[model samples]
Target: IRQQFAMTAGSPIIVNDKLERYAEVRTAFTHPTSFFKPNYKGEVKPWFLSAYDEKVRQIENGENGPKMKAKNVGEARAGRALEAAGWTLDINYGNIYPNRFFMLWSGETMTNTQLWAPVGLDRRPPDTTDPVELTNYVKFAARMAGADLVGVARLNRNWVYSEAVTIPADVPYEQSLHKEIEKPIVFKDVPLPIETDDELIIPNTCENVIVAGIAMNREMMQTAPNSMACATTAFCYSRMCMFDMWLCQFIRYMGYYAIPSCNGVGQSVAFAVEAGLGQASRMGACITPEFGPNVRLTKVFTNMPLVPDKPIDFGVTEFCETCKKCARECPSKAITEGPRTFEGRSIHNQSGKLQWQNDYNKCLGYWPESGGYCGVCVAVCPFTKNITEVWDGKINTYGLDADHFRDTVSFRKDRV
Candidate 1:
């Protein structure tokens, strides 16, 4: 695997001179233009909940509804149950905010901190500071903490949120939403991660980000656009939460403050690209050589100095241009089938970056309709399909050929 990724000298994914920092408020999730939309009840709700009523009906009927109904009632129930079970660790709506328990900070003081306080393990100045040594140690620790793949990058403020969802320090979890507010995460010459009345500011000294990729089960994901696929998508989110907490604690124990962002912090794909984990694809996912777009991403920001990995060029952009499988298979036709551009197709995308712009609103609309988080685009993706085969050495380094993808999928048939 290492042999396949030998980095030849080339240009970085984005030219340093041309790269631009993006405001998180501009993303579809935070932007007012796409944040609130009409649900099935004709009432406004988060874009992701637009088809909420339809989803409830589908789940109650033990079906995925008119669009992608399960062939059997059993499949529908399993899918719904799995999706619910997957949220076991995703407290507070996917941990979509900063300074919340399980995200930026733990609610209660850590037992580990107390356990090792007598010896001052955390206070014993970091034993590892050399970028090369720290990179090796942190990446090793990341894998031990459940990251299937890991990379280091100089933290680019461009992807960091200009403002983050936060609540008053005294607010309890139940009342957090009522008290939630957006706070600027200013990065200037400062001392440490400090909190003011309405902001969480990181010092300029906090300069590195460690990105982790948690690989999903291919067999389960290949069942995409179906309940089974939703099961895989659901489970990985919990995995991401665990990874962040475990790794963040490890970093702190190593004498550095670590900020955990399971799903909140910033634009993951851009960070993943700069971290040299993968290349951007038309599916609007970071396509890694190891797992394609089948992996989920979560990042940790810290002051730990680490050597950055060079960006990879694994032919994802070129391939996405020719293979329109994901776009064609997209249940909602959300992915663009056209050439990459800086212009966005809708309010969901953060424009000015060279890449295919997807209609995220369309993608979110299908989630409720499918009665689960839909993975149709992920399913039909050639790269995602061949993950298992490549790992088993059934295919070459590049994995499945575009024409051979049909052989991978199993369709409904009468069982004996």
Candidate 2:
């Protein structure tokens, strides 16, 4: 994977002690303000439960869910159509969340067919030992597998979260509903996946990390602060599912084992920046050159023989130094407008970096009240706006450059 930017190393997100209640899975699921309310024929219900009921009803009654609201048959058809022109690929959407049937968080066999069998990978010895061949083959495969952007980096322990906070075992989904437990995620000295004292240790042989970005539709975001806009937000999440699984299976097919983690593992923004995808911005999103912050990110951990991409040193850290547009427009006052410090932004933010941090708990609070994931920050970012046609054209935000200074400039036709 070739990077378009240079990387600058920063402190990782781990802390010696856990943030109070920050490790709770229930934070997003059970927070009084983060909880959702649904509009059921003018009556309201819990968002997910209500949506699940509507989904089951639609499926059982032989109707499409929200697409049923299309103004006409053509409109409805247009809305649900899947444009297969990007590149021919088969990426299963169900694999984003690890350990969930198709997306097993671990390689451990959950069924009878797998328990007695040897390791599923290493089925055939790897063929591409040469550097050029390996890079070409793997990156080509990654592009075909749905990565808008792909970059490689050596596994940096500093970037990994010290503990992965997840749900407990033996608890059913319905019962596991709003509880979370934090487990230490230490590094083991071995060459494969193993369990250590209360922690899951990834071996030193776990050499490389692949970071990829999934693009979000611009039209849907133009309607920001609305439901259809939020639908675009949710759809890209499913896109994240496809990107991880597709790239992972490609690596496994190449005879290397891969550990896929969506939001469950270490910090993605840090990984992205380190891989040279883009710089970390004030609102806590990974802003890229092509898409700015209008993209979803997912990564896979592997031991594949790949060269690492360099860290980026773009002007984002400096630009964000003066630009507080996100902080200003944040409806929840969830962003910080102060000097860069090693202090935690809030319960949700991990401290240690002398960079602008956001108060994510406050950010979550606005969701229940707005009934949607707010995108005011993304919407107002000057760089995030559509600039495909502009192509380096500068607009007079404050004033125009001194182009025709010696000669008087014209305000009307032939006024000069």
Candidate 3:
């Protein structure tokens, strides 16, 4: 549905006049009031420490829920093991630590740079700088780099965080929990994205954002609060990490600088919205015609010239207005049942955003209790369904419908 289906000429979301760029500190994962947790040792600490205690407890008790136990401790261990293994390439949901791990700001620091040092891939000047050619080439490269869906848009600074929650570069991963600090993200007249002691700089030339959607396996996702659900979510985080590094290298090799922010620098949902990948739903997830809320997003910021995609509207706002199924099914009772409003319902929300504001703290609080990151909202979303009957008999690569796959096939002449 990406190439051939639908598109809107302008911004699709509605908001009041008071809309302001949201801050990273206001989100559920980073706010001071909501960012407390305990380690496996049972000591209270900031961030996701306490959630570790509950995961271990559930494992030893041989149960994922409070009363119902798995068949045995062995089965419970397998689930946790699978979940843990999936996060080997990620850290803390892939965003909290900016300019670290998978979110490096410079392609000069990547392993690919070292691997192809002799080829001078990063040293050569760009041969193809035309926006139309660049856009088509990059989109195809995105698919090769494991992105199931990709879109381009002008960088909207309102969606970028004023400051990022990151630890000092000297701090080891073990001590990052207690060493967190905030740094401002400023656009400067510089040549590249360079992080200084006082700020994280974004070059004025870095004008466009490339957003990718990594679709998840619905079978594992529908497991909800169980360990299998956690496994799928965790695995997608790693996939998101891989997608960033791979795509960043492609952009850099094309004689452009690319900033890989797997889960850092800005909000994914906002970028996805602006990039025409999908529409925002009541669950706060970007619902696409293909996958609904069951997709994970990661993005790359670059100076590469490309045509921007249009935002789409298939009536998500109207559909979410009366559909409170997510609100009704959420175990944390975090989703909002009331009408959309400009005012935020709580500190966890960014005020003045026109949408159904849910209590994100309530959503985060359920992680420990459920022994996993509960994805019940995604499981119950109505859009997470198959649209066609497998083309009446067969399927295509990556489960995509082959007949309509070219619908998303874009060219420079296709857009103005």
Candidate 4:
């Protein structure tokens, strides 16, 4: 199975260039959307925070976060507590959105750069230019950085945001929201990672992006719509953040410029799909053959010359066509059980993508109600369900097994 699924040259899936178009950053629920409904207090905010007050109330009263009801109060409460504890190391709300500290100037003099400044790693030219050698070295470093799966691809500018949410350099974190602004990210022929007053420019020199898949816990994520699921989600965000920083630093030390983005820089799923990490699925996730959709994605933009992995075709589209498990299990009925289309179902979805268009507003609306980051869609995914058992010894692919699982876990153990 491993040999069969092993990535080889050539695009694994066909993309209709005329039909698949670039998406704007605003169409996502986290930004401007037609579904920005008010909360119970009549305050308009992100859909996920629509019932913010009620969520706090439920939690304080020993109830499960939001839409959840307590069958076992002890279990529910313990789950919620674990979820909160998981976010301790994560910056600013699990780093779900980007910010200056985490997503800022990927190649510029960062704290890490300053710490290693005396070594002059940034001043040296790249030592390894061979694509094969760089690929092997980077993949090894990526695994060391907490990535379970790693793939390389030429950067697709279409998936990158034309403008991103940002604040002024001098603005403090407390004033970030009040001083928020959108800045253009122009890809031009200038030097990369340039920051001006109103724009962040990436020069044409940035030729590739290395995408990583941070696998989640099957035992925890399977608890869906509950606190345990949220815990896994939160922990993975921190993992994604660390992967970006660690990998970025490694690339820089290798005498190449590296730009890191956790969840802030661009559309990760698109990059992951193009990098052959997985195929797009009905849940709007990149479902990998190894871990399914139960993984978090992060990427590093660089000038490092590396061979691009061919895209993979794992029957995800055909499987999703017949299986409406995610759609049926979705609490808000957010997922569409219909066929893929080029147009979006609502303003929240970007038009011209030939894939399932989910109601992200409805999905986010359920979060505040559940008082937790619900994972019913991910939990119900057939691919996700199969991976845990496959890795647990029911089925073995190559050398993949409990030991490999423990190997991944050990990365986290060493980090902590």
lDDT, candidate 4, 39-158, per-residue tens = 657677665556455556565565554545554455455655666666665655534333367665554557778888888887788877898888888888998888888888899876
Query: For model 3, how does the per-residue alpha-carbon lDDT over 1-416 read when each residue is reduced to its tens digit?
Result: 45464575655666677777666777778888888755555576654557777778877998654444777787777778878897888886775567886788777767779889899887899999899889988888887887878989998887788888898988988897778888888899998789999999999999999999987766666767877778778878888888888888888888899987877888888889989999888989899877889888989899999888889778888899988999999998999988888888787776666777989988987776677888999988998751112113353444345554564554545443
lDDT for predicted candidate 4 compared with the true structure = 0.72
Alpha-carbon deviation at 412 in model 2, angstroms: 50
User: What lDDT score belongs to each candidate, Candidate 1 first?
Assistant: 0.70, 0.57, 0.79, 0.72
Winning model by TM-score: 3
Give every collision pair in model 1.
none
> Is candidate 3 or 4 superior in TM-score?
3
Q: Relative to the unseen true structure, what is the C-alpha lDDT of residue 70 in candidate 2, on a scale of 0 to 100? A: 31
Query: What ordering of candidates by TM-score runs from best to worst?
Result: 3, 4, 1, 2
**In model 3, which residue pairs have backbone atoms overlapping below 3 Å?**
2-408, 3-407, 3-408, 4-407, 37-50, 38-49, 38-50, 95-263
Clashing pairs in 2: 6-311, 6-312, 6-313, 7-311, 7-312, 98-105, 99-103, 99-104, 99-105
Question: Per-prediction TM-score, please?
Answer: 0.84, 0.70, 0.90, 0.85
Q: After superposition, how far is residue 381 of candidate 1 from its true place, in Å?
A: 0.8
Query: Which of the two candidates, 2 or 3, achieves a greater TM-score against the reference?
Result: 3
RMSD of 3: 4.5
Model 3 local distance difference test score: 0.79
**Candidate 3: which stretches are off by over 4 Å?**
2-5, 37-47, 386-416
